[PDB]
Ligand binder design. Structure first.
Ligand SMILES: Nc1ncnc2c1ncn2[C@@H]1O[C@H](COP(=O)(O)OP(=O)(O)O)[C@@H](O)[C@H]1O
Ligand SMILES: Nc1ncnc2c1ncn2[C@@H]1O[C@H](COP(=O)(O)OP(=O)(O)O)[C@@H](O)[C@H]1O
Ligand SMILES: [Mg+2]
Ligand SMILES: [Mg+2]
Lengths: 419, 419, 206
């Protein structure tokens, strides 16, 4: 009846559903084709069919309603919307549209939208009056996103260390710097669990670029939110498309006074896709990266801000360093001081089998007075006073044993004042 | 009626204003497009429309009237001026023009200027006879800009320390040297507050290059003057454009016997933009900076001077050191002895959580006899006689406690003579 | 319709031949005008002829003149083009007195092979060249004149010593720029100047 649940159902249930409807030879076809075949057979029955998706306005004028299940990939089951709907209902890219759809008339291969009754989880009339994201005035982060989980076991202290190293708030534009094989993949998993548990209201989005297929499955099964990704086999034009879709969708949610958190991975890989797709403008910098090529990722990364009117957009990205590629290090140079939060991971700490491998001295956040209270903020200052003299390799080891014997970070603070 | 107040009004008021005029679908558009749409509807009504902006003469011959609200960014609402106006009214880049404008006729997408009745806040006839800035004879600073604020609380002693460290006067060309995360961002805020409070007559301009969007908003909300900035997402060609617009506007104000103060931030980042935009001339120095590339920032920085005929131009810039980039340190070498005032901030003082982190021994000013009185000048000499022997790390700590127990710097002077 | 507006606008006698008239009529009109023009020159009188178009005129001569057994590219006989060259070449300045000025328009890029071969024979036969660019015309900027390609030969006699050298410096700054934007540069500069003399002094200013 509704396209939303058909994609969520496994392929095995779809095969059984299609067989009783009279369809045949469905197991050997793709999942997208099965959905189209099932809808087509149900469409001619006469019962109304609903749908949902994310609008993607093309340069021609007509758009499509991509689905987050397929990672916003074009497919036969995508809903086609004529430019007339964009006229009557003023819509932009990334808008969420849910409504009745009609069977595709002969001469067209895509379903068409009949009527719109829900735009961005709101009435269509109210969505027309929402202020644009650009017109919103950015501000510093005010409310802190707690990272410590009470249910979290003492085996993994990554969540607790992040609170001591660099607190994160709504609208933060933090950047993660880490060499390869430094544990950055599961570092975001701890952040995703903490955000989902401590702040269920916040919308969590995980974006993966050039990630292995196995990595995508575990992220979807672990993160309590919608996760989109693009495998390495997909062309470069697909990687940029996924990134553009997520940021546009995130901006629309911000306009509705809603908080959305994006865990980008990785900014270095994302800039590679933009460099390839964007044609050369005649100016080539070191490493073969065009100056105009890096303009797009900066605008995407810089969109993170705290809106004074309401809502916030928090973007956390991982930067790859010491990867052996000249093109990778030059990108990190452009994104050096562009973030208000720095989280540097050390390779030499990681090889010592001590986790989390966080360089406490280098990592930090800017304007942390607003995030933390008066007492909590000054308790971190004295902690940094005793961690700075010691080496970074043993600095993490010092915190690991101290945090192990303390149930919570509050107990750790009073222990430090004891000596 | 007038374009000046439309930009100052928030977006919410613009939406309400447009709706009663018959416009529709304005919330989803940019603020610049809303202004153009509102003006277009009001233009066909018949009532006269005024305008204001800063002239930007292009290489073709025609100019535009950029607005300081949009940080001198090209937009649909910019006023177009034909070369005929530049002929009849001899105008240069950076001139402020205010006058009636006409609706755009078909075949043009920009408003046109009808008549000019105010040039540089003066009659157009008188502005034609103003002497060029280059012909003015520079001189040393004579009148000192007081930095100590009576209303200033004892919690922040940064304003008082600057008076003891290095006094600043009109036409000063001071340079600030500080490592990253040394408190330079709010250091200029204290200077901006002192200049606005002690000397409301002086025109204060704050220029930010490659600054985060959140940093821009707080500067505008705090500085009692017009503030222009360029975010990191904007291309390199935008950063140079903003810098050129400010200096040209500042020079024109000086020609009208007016004092203008520019708080540049940062000179290191500004030189990066010039290096990228300027094509290579075949000669490459250390770090990849062309010799001709650094010529433009030196001319911009060197424009600060005290005019004997009248007025002054004070430029204060922050230089980034110990940033880990080879290109950053070579730029500082060229700007080492180019400033008559030196203000060095120490990283090791900053990490001790003692502020302001100012290296008193290294910081100083040249030709301070004119700025200070006979008694005040010699009182600083004895102070430097007792601060030089002690280390720079504890030198600031010595001043902090001494200034805390003294209400004003005058009371601090007599206390030193007591012992 | 084109004939009527020319007669109502040109302050002189205008002759024309419509397309419906046979080819033998087109040659007859051309022969009558040149013969009349020559007689006026003999009486120490100046006559100016605005021919339009030389390409179309050669078509009429090619049709009426019988083939001589030799056919060039495009089907134009060598002897067929002899007559238009003599007609076009009659323009000259008479030392004894009077003059004969002939200005003709040549059609190019018309999609016809016969039209382009005719232009080849009339390439270097004129002492003045005035080339119009199609891409400038479609930009809705007029006149669409290719300044770099257009020019005249032996212009020292026509212009004065000061005026001639003022054009040389103008060509020195128009040659580097593209022909599409060269006309746009002149249009704005000439708009702000009342006369060409004021345009000359403006250029040296910068
Ligand atoms: N908090 C942690 N606790 C235990 N092991 C960790 C932790 N973080 C990382 N690791 C180790 O790192 C390895 C995975 O690293 P990975 O996340 O793939 O790095 P990268 O993403 O840079 O390739 C695992 O084998 C795991 O043992
Ligand atoms: N005068 C001051 N009083 C108190 N704290 C200060 C002062 N100056 C700087 N700071 C500290 O510096 C931090 C901000 O540094 P910032 O200005 O961002 O340095 P940078 O601009 O080099 O990054 C704040 O957390 C603040 O606590
Ligand atoms: Mg990984
Ligand atoms: Mg700063």
């Amino acid at each position: 009846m509704n396209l939303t649940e058909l994609k969520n159902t496994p392929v095995s249930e779809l095969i059984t559903l299609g067989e009783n409807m009279g369809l045949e030879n469905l197991a050997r076809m793709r999942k997208q084709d099965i959905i189209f075949a099932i809808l087509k057979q149900h469409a001619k029955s006469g019962e109304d069919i609903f749908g949902d998706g994310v609008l993607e306005i093309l340069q021609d004028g007509f758009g499509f309603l991509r689905s987050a299940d397929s990672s916003y990939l074009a497919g036969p089951d995508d809903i086609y919307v004529s430019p007339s709907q964009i006229r009557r209902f003023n819509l932009r890219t990334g808008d969420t549209i849910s409504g009745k759809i009609r069977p595709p008339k002969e001469g067209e291969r895509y379903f068409a939208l009949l009527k719109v009754n829900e735009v961005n989880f709101d009435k269509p009339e109210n969505a027309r009056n929402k202020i644009l994201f650009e017109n919103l005035t950015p501000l510093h982060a005010n409310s802190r996103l707690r990272m410590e989980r009470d249910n979290g076991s003492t085996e993994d202290l990554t969540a607790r260390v992040l609170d001591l190293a660099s607190p994160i708030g709504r609208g933060q534009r933090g950047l993660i710097v880490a060499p390869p094989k430094a544990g950055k993949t599961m570092l975001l998993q701890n952040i995703a669990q903490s955000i989902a548990y401590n702040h269920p209201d916040c919308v969590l989005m995980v974006l993966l670029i050039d990630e292995r297929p196995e990595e995508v499955t575990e992220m979807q099964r672990l993160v309590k939110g919608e996760v989109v990704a693009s495998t390495f086999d997909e062309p470069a034009s697909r990687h940029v498309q996924v990134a553009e879709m997520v940021i546009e969708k995130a901006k629309r949610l911000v306009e509705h006074k809603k908080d959305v958190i994006i865990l980008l991975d990785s900014i270095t890989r994302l800039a590679r896709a933009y460099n390839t797709v964007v044609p050369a403008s005649g100016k080539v910098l070191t490493g073969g990266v065009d100056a105009n090529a890096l303009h797009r990722p900066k605008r995407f990364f810089g969109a993170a801000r705290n809106v004074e009117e309401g809502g916030s957009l928090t973007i956390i990205a991982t930067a790859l360093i010491d990867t052996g590629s000249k093109m990778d290090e030059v990108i990190y140079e452009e994104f050096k001081g562009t973030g208000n939060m720095e989280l540097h991971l050390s390779r030499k700490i990681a090889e010592k089998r001590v986790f989390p491998a966080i360089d406490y001295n280098r990592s930090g956040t800017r304007k942390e007075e607003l995030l933390t209270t008066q007492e909590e903020l000054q308790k971190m200052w004295i902690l940094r006073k005793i961690i700075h003299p010691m080496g970074e390799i043993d600095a993490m080891e010092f915190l690991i044993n101290k945090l192990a014997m303390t149930k919570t970070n509050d107990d750790f603070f009073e222990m430090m004042k004891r000596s």
